[PDB]
Design a protein around this ligand. Structure first.
Ligand SMILES: *[C@@H]1O[C@H](CO)[C@@H](O[C@@H]2O[C@H](CO)[C@@H](O[C@@H]3O[C@H](CO)[C@@H](O[C@@H]4O[C@H](CO)[C@@H](O)[C@H](O)[C@H]4NC(C)=O)[C@H](O[C@H]4O[C@H](CO[C@H]5O[C@H](CO)[C@@H](O)[C@H](O)[C@@H]5O)[C@@H](O)[C@H](O)[C@@H]4O)[C@@H]3O)[C@H](O)[C@H]2NC(C)=O)[C@H](O)[C@H]1NC(C)=O
Ligand SMILES: *[C@@H]1O[C@H](CO)[C@@H](O[C@@H]2O[C@H](CO)[C@@H](O[C@@H]3O[C@H](CO[C@H]4O[C@H](CO)[C@@H](O)[C@H](O)[C@@H]4O)[C@@H](O)[C@H](O[C@H]4O[C@H](CO)[C@@H](O)[C@H](O)[C@@H]4O)[C@@H]3O)[C@H](O)[C@H]2NC(C)=O)[C@H](O)[C@H]1NC(C)=O
Ligand SMILES: *[C@@H]1O[C@H](CO)[C@@H](O[C@@H]2O[C@H](CO)[C@@H](O[C@@H]3O[C@H](CO[C@H]4O[C@H](CO)[C@@H](O)[C@H](O)[C@@H]4O)[C@@H](O)[C@H](O[C@H]4O[C@H](CO)[C@@H](O)[C@H](O)[C@@H]4O)[C@@H]3O)[C@H](O)[C@H]2NC(C)=O)[C@H](O)[C@H]1NC(C)=O
Ligand SMILES: *[C@@H]1O[C@H](CO)[C@@H](O[C@@H]2O[C@H](CO)[C@@H](O[C@@H]3O[C@H](CO)[C@@H](O[C@@H]4O[C@H](CO)[C@@H](O)[C@H](O)[C@H]4NC(C)=O)[C@H](O)[C@@H]3O)[C@H](O)[C@H]2NC(C)=O)[C@H](O)[C@H]1NC(C)=O
Ligand SMILES: *[C@@H]1O[C@H](CO)[C@@H](O[C@@H]2O[C@H](CO)[C@@H](O[C@@H]3O[C@H](CO)[C@@H](O)[C@H](O)[C@@H]3O)[C@H](O)[C@H]2NC(C)=O)[C@H](O)[C@H]1NC(C)=O
Ligand SMILES: *[C@@H]1O[C@H](CO)[C@@H](O[C@@H]2O[C@H](CO)[C@@H](O[C@@H]3O[C@H](CO)[C@@H](O)[C@H](O)[C@@H]3O)[C@H](O)[C@H]2NC(C)=O)[C@H](O)[C@H]1NC(C)=O
Ligand SMILES: *[C@@H]1O[C@H](CO)[C@@H](O[C@@H]2O[C@H](CO)[C@@H](O)[C@H](O)[C@H]2NC(C)=O)[C@H](O)[C@H]1NC(C)=O
Ligand SMILES: *[C@@H]1O[C@H](CO)[C@@H](O)[C@H](O)[C@H]1NC(C)=O
Lengths: 222, 206, 461, 135
């Protein structure tokens, strides 16, 4: 096995409207308090449940937000969905859907949670990435003691991610959380372990991908 | 929301006790945790019931209103934020503010550090960036300093607060930025961590 | 040769089962003198008759930690406090200030911070409100405003602000639980009174004899005496520090009360509410001054080291005073129905014990008669029930009171138990574990009046 | 203890509509088996009914004993369905009528059928002496 996914837009504009979708293994089983939910967390904040739906379209709603939200599906299309009001940028968050399994009608299970969505809000639109290899001009190490990678810059918003020869050379990795580039953009670093003296007998590749532009690009580290 | 304490700190050998409070009914509170930047993880269910096949050190337990969570043998990796979750009126599912955990007596570890020079596609645009990477340290403390000759940090002070790795060690990065002529006219190209006051330095050269 | 099925009814069999049970109780401790009172409510008068038949040749499994009755009567009973949640007085739902330096009464008392005080920043800031005044001791002087503080009414900051006024009763009546029909209660007995695993002289009843409430942090009291020596109980006694309990031969006394007098000046406050503003300084010179017949304590520890030698071989062994935290963790606890109080188990209980071929060094003292005296604290503003957001400023009572007690057992924990001088402290445990006392005698079963077996008899067709 | 099927015994609710499925599954349709001082009165009055319902149930058990069907759930005896009873026919009852309809048909003959059972049972006892009266 069981896994969940959610997906939607990578950015929303200031006072526009979000919409999102959620699909899964575990397909529409009518099990032990079985349902699905939507949850969000403010930037670095606590968790917040929004809403959920069960083994028939019995469905339930937050008191404080109510008109701000609405929930349904086309059962045949096998996505759970969520639809919302127009947006104040504070509604930016880590958002997730999740699976429910509450017993005979009590006792909590949210027994699976999806990889989530980077729901992000600004008055501005998307901007695409610039990528740079980082290997230095002068060198002194020997053997597999070294590590190298690529910078990413000038994009907005996140996510961007990196892989090492389509996963095939993944070892001794470091990855750093991205930082706001002070013009109102973002920047990222990720690194992989390498032989200090044997670059070019094999090639080490930054496989960079950026969802908002859907830009995917491969560059040599050496 | 469900009220709980903000933060908990204890020795690495010690079986820590955590609690959160059910505002109503309470006797079905599940537990979950939040190691940061990532999807959360399931803990105890029903009441006291052990989740199937996840790490066995997290301790099934009960209370009537002060719903309670614990660890058996505490370990360094357990530094994370911990949450209560509840049924409530008509499917009003309720949730806590979190509680952070710190695992004292843990050694710490001195920074692993790396520095990289600016790139040709910056030099074509009169730009330059030095990329400083700070990693493998403990506790989650950092400050950072630079020596682009005698000059202060320029064109992006852009530096992370402390962040956790895959292991219970911590990391950050910094991006001192210049014009290409500032890069060519300077000659010292150096970054220094000052983590817990410890002097740790990297430098680049043509 | 072959076999076939047959069935029998009245077969002697039962199985262990979670259930509710219903309660017998004292026939006169409540009466028409106490209309609508919670002790008068629900469960029935007393049964004199509990018979038995013997389990000749026959034995059964027990586990006091596993048994559900702890929850059965942790539920029901605490609803006395739910019935006791009287509203806040009109003057004080908000965090009011109070002004004093010496007392508003004729003197501040002979012992500690009893510096009685008027409300001042008090809703309307008006004589009808600010004329009203409270008894002081300790938590009542907590800081509000700046230096030269107008002191904090601390009771405002928690989810329930209330008082259980003196009309409410807290008498520890003996309940006598009986199981529903077709259920039965089984009673374990042997000199090996361990209370988990197999039991030999197991016995049958329609109902238990009387067992009584208790409300202690560290020393259990005023109830079920042991069978003829001392014994220790634990879930898994091999454990490092998980809670331990000790049960006593001979009820050693606690010899004290805190008879400091304040007069019956209650007030029909505000919009026709009630409050207990007890004042004046007649009988003000008095303190808890607590005492114990030392030898009758000493005997327990000096035997107990031998008992512990069976569980932890040859090592030097130790008690230390109770663990830190709030005064409550720092102390043994009581209220007479008159004042809330907390004695210093965090000064007492400090003894080491030698355990080689020993003939020495196991006690406070030896060969003096003499007895001892001990000192103890009061807390007049209370988180009145642990593990809930409820708090009360306590209503006082005049003069000396008919109170004192004697001790049935210790609540205990093995703090520091990874090195020689093997260490322990008084305290620990759930608030529930008060009610472990005696209940190790029992378990509840459901009867199952039919069963099936093979036979040689082939049925008609 | 347990819920309710119209009554705490007899357990109407699996009405089945067609008598066919209902009869062909009749086994499972039971084989599945002042503060508070006025709680005296609010125990007394339903207690009376509860007891008198068991007494009703015992009236039924008495009739079942009288027909020689003690503890049975489906039962039969000697008596024929001798032609003049409505001719609705086996293959034309259960599949096209309901228990409530069947009563609304059959209500006339009730005491007569009961008497025919009584007589037949009482004869069936002594009829065995046609073989066993050896002394
Ligand atoms: C013959 O005539 C009968 C009527 O006399 C018909 O029966 C009726 O059938 C309908 C469904 O077909 C049923 O509908 C009711 O609709 C309500 C309004 O939609 C619904 O109320 C909910 O209200 C909240 C308000 O905030 C909303 O958030 C909900 O979205 C809203 N709708 C729904 C669908 O939830 C009624 O809800 C029923 O179910 C809940 C269940 O909740 C409990 O179980 C959960 C299990 O996981 C547990 O988690 C929860 O904690 C709860 O314990 C109950 O709480 C409600 O009491 C209620 O039972 C409901 O859907 C009517 O109620 C039916 N009436 C009767 C008397 O049963 C019949 O179909 C007709 N047949 C024919 C052939 O004509
Ligand atoms: C809890 O409450 C009980 C009851 O109030 C207290 O008293 C118990 O009382 C009995 C009866 O007196 C005690 O048993 C007696 O012990 C004496 C000492 O035994 C040691 O020394 C002898 C030599 O004198 C050794 O042989 C023996 O191995 C021991 O090392 C004995 O002198 C007594 O002997 C008498 O009884 C026997 C047996 O029937 C007769 O044949 C003899 O003729 C003689 O008359 C007797 O055995 C008992 O020790 C007390 N119990 C305990 C456990 O102390 C408790 O003291 C009190 N406290 C505790 C901790 O239980
Ligand atoms: C352990 O067990 C002992 C012994 O039973 C208990 O102490 C006894 O408690 C009863 C019940 O209160 C006392 O009997 C009656 O007390 C009334 C006074 O009530 C005050 O005291 C109680 C605490 O005991 C407070 O909660 C309450 O708020 C009051 O402040 C008296 O009015 C009664 O008077 C009658 O008896 C006296 C003689 O005793 C006569 O002079 C009178 O004319 C009248 O007939 C009565 O006294 C009893 O006195 C207490 N005895 C002792 C030795 O203290 C403990 O409470 C119990 N619990 C614990 C934890 O130890
Ligand atoms: C710790 O507190 C407990 C509970 O209050 C004390 O428990 C027991 O208290 C009694 C009375 O103080 C002690 O004395 C014996 O009591 C019995 C029962 O009253 C007496 O037996 C006979 O009882 C009837 C009815 O009461 C009476 O009519 C008879 O006259 C009377 N006597 C006879 C010969 O028939 C008996 O004589 C004693 O007076 C108990 O000893 C005590 N229980 C135990 C097991 O010791 C306990 O005393 C107290 N301990 C301390 C140190 O404070
Ligand atoms: C603390 O408790 C001890 C032990 O009970 C008290 O000391 C001694 O107690 C015994 C009884 O246990 C007394 O014995 C009796 O003595 C009289 C003669 O006085 C005799 O007729 C009886 O047959 C019986 O033997 C003993 O006298 C007593 N000794 C002393 C010196 O007190 C002690 O008094 C208690 N102290 C307090 C303040 O509680
Ligand atoms: C026994 O069955 C009958 C019929 O189902 C029940 O009703 C009674 O039936 C008779 C005969 O039909 C009625 O008498 C007369 O019948 C003719 C022809 O149908 C009609 O033209 C007359 O107007 C008259 O109805 C009789 O009136 C009717 N009774 C009632 C109250 O309507 C009878 O009740 C059943 N008895 C039992 C004990 O089951
Ligand atoms: C008398 O009571 C006080 C509380 O009023 C005890 O307070 C603390 O208790 C712990 C456990 O014993 C100690 O670690 C602390 O050092 C104590 N603090 C203070 C300020 O005393 C106290 O222990 C008791 N008195 C003595 C002499 O032990
Ligand atoms: C059965 O026989 C009797 C006479 O013995 C007759 O009156 C009746 O109509 C017949 N049929 C039924 C079904 O009773």
């Amino acid at each position: 096995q069981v896994t969940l996914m959610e997906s939607g837009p990578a950015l929303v504009k200031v006072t526009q409207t979000l919409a999102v979708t959620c699909t899964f293994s575990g397909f529409s089983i009518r099990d032990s308090g079985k349902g699905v939910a939507w949850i969000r967390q403010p930037p670095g904040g606590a968790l917040e449940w929004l809403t959920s739906i069960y083994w028939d379209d019995t469905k339930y709603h937050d008191t404080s937000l109510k008109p701000r939200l609405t929930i349904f599906r086309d059962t045949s299309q096998t996505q759970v969905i969520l639809i919302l009001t127009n947006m104040a940028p504070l509604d930016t968050a880590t958002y997730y859907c999740g699976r429910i399994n509450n017993g005979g009608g009590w006792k909590d299970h949210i027994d699976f949670w999806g990889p989530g969505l980077l729901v992000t809000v600004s008055s501005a639109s998307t901007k695409g990435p610039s990528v740079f290899p980082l290997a230095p001009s002068s060198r002194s190490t020997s053997e597999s003691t070294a590590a190298l990678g690529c910078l990413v810059k000038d994009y907005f918003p996140e996510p961007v991610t990196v892989s090492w020869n389509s996963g095939s050379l993944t070892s001794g990795v470091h990855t750093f959380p991205a930082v706001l580039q002070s013009s109102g953009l973002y920047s990222l670093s990720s690194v992989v372990t390498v032989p200090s003296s044997s670059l070019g007998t094999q090639t080490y590749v930054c496989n960079v991908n950026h969802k908002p532009s859907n830009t995917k690009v491969d560059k040599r580290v050496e | 929301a469900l009220t709980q304490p903000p933060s908990v700190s204890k020795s690495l050998e010690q079986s820590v006790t955590i609690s959160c409070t059910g505002t109503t009914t309470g006797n079905s509170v599940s537990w979950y945790q939040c190691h940061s930047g990532t999807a959360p993880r399931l803990l105890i269910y029903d009441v006291n019931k052990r989740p199937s096949g996840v790490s066995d050190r997290f301790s099934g337990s009960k209370s009537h209103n002060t719903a309670s969570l614990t660890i058996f043998g505490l370990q360094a990796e357990d530094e994370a934020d911990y949450y209560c979750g509840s049924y409530g009126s008509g499917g009003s599912l309720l949730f806590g503010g979190g509680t952070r955990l710190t695992v004292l007596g843990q050694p710490k570890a001195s920074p692993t550090v790396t520095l990289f020079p600016p790139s040709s596609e910056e030099l074509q645009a009169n730009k330059a960036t030095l990329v400083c990477l700070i990693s493998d340290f403990y506790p989650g403390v950092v400050k950072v300093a630079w020596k682009a000759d005698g000059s202060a940090v320029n064109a992006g002070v852009e530096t992370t607060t402390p962040s956790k790795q895959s292991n219970n060690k911590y990391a950050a990065s910094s991006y001192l930025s210049l014009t290409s002529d500032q890069w060519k006219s300077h000659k010292s190209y150096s970054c220094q961590v000052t983590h817990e006051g410890s002097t740790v330095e990297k430098t680049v050269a043509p | 040769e072959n076999l076939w099925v047959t069935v029998y009814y009245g077969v002697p069999v039962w199985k262990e089962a979670k259930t509710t049970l219903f309660c017998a109780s004292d026939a006169k401790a409540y009466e028409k003198e106490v209309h609508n009172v919670w002790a008068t409510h629900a469960c029935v008068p007393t049964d004199p008759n509990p018979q038995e038949m013997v389990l000749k040749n026959v034995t059964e499994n027990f586990n006091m930690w596993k048994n559900d009755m702890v929850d059965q009567m942790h539920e029901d009973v605490i609803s006395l406090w739910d019935q006791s949640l009287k509203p806040c007085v009109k003057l004080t739902p908000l965090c009011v200030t109070l002004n004093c330096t010496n007392a508003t009464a004729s003197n501040s008392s002979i012992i500690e911070g009893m510096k009685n005080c008027s409300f001042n920043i008090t809703t309307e800031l008006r004589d009808k409100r600010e004329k009203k005044n409270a008894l002081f001791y300790k938590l009542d002087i907590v800081q509000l405003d700046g230096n030269s503080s107008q002191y904090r009414l601390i009771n405002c900051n928690t989810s329930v602000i209330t008082q259980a006024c003196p009309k409410v009763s807290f008498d520890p009546i003996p309940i006598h639980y009986c199981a529903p029909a077709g259920y039965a209660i089984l009673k374990c007995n042997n000199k090996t009174f361990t209370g988990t695993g197999p039991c030999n002289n197991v016995s049958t009843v329609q109902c238990t004899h009387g067992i009584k409430p208790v409300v202690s942090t560290q020393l259990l009291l005023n109830g079920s005496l042991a069978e003829g020596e001392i014994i220790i109980r634990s879930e898994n006694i091999t454990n490092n520090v998980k809670t331990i309990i000790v049960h006593l031969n001979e009820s050693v006394k606690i010899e004290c009360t805190r008879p400091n007098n304040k007069t019956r000046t209650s007030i029909r406050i505000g919009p026709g509410q009630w409050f207990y503003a007890t004042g004046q300084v007649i009988g003000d010179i008095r303190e808890a001054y607590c005492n114990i017949n030392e030898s009758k304590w000493n005997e327990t520890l000096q035997r107990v080291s031998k008992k512990l030698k069976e569980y932890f071989p040859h090592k030097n062994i130790t008690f230390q005073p109770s663990s830190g935290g709030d005064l409550e963790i720092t102390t043994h606890s009581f209220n007479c129905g008159g004042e809330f109080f907390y004695c210093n188990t965090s000064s007492l209980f400090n003894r080491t014990y030698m355990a080689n071929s020993t003939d020495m060094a196991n006690s406070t003292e030896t060969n003096s008669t003499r007895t001892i005296t001990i000192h103890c604290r009061i807390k007049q503003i209370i988180n009145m029930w642990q593990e809930v957001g409820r708090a009360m400023y306590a209503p006082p009572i005049a003069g000396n009171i008919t109170c004192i007690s004697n001790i049935t057992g210790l609540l205990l924990t093995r703090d520091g138990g990874k090195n020689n001088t093997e260490t322990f402290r008084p305290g620990g445990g759930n608030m529930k574990d008060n009610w472990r006392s005696e209940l190790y005698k029992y378990k509840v079963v459901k009867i199952e009046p039919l069963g099936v077996a093979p036979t040689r008899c082939k049925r008609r067709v | 203890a347990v819920g309710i099927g119209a009554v705490f015994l007899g357990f109407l609710g699996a009405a089945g509509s067609t008598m066919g499925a209902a009869s062909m599954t009749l086994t499972v349709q039971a084989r599945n088996l002042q503060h508070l001082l006025k709680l005296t009165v609010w125990g007394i009055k339903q207690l009376q009914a509860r007891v008198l319902a068991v007494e009703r149930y015992l009236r039924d058990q008495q009739l079942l004993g009288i027909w020689g069907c003690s503890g049975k759930l489906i039962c039969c005896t000697n008596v024929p369905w001798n032609s003049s009873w409505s001719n609705r026919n086996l293959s034309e009852i259960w599949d096209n009528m309901t228990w409530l309809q069947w009563d609304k048909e059959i209500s006339n003959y009730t005491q007569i059928i009961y008497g025919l059972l009584e007589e037949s049972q009482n004869q069936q006892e002594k009829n065995e002496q046609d073989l066993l009266a050896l002394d």
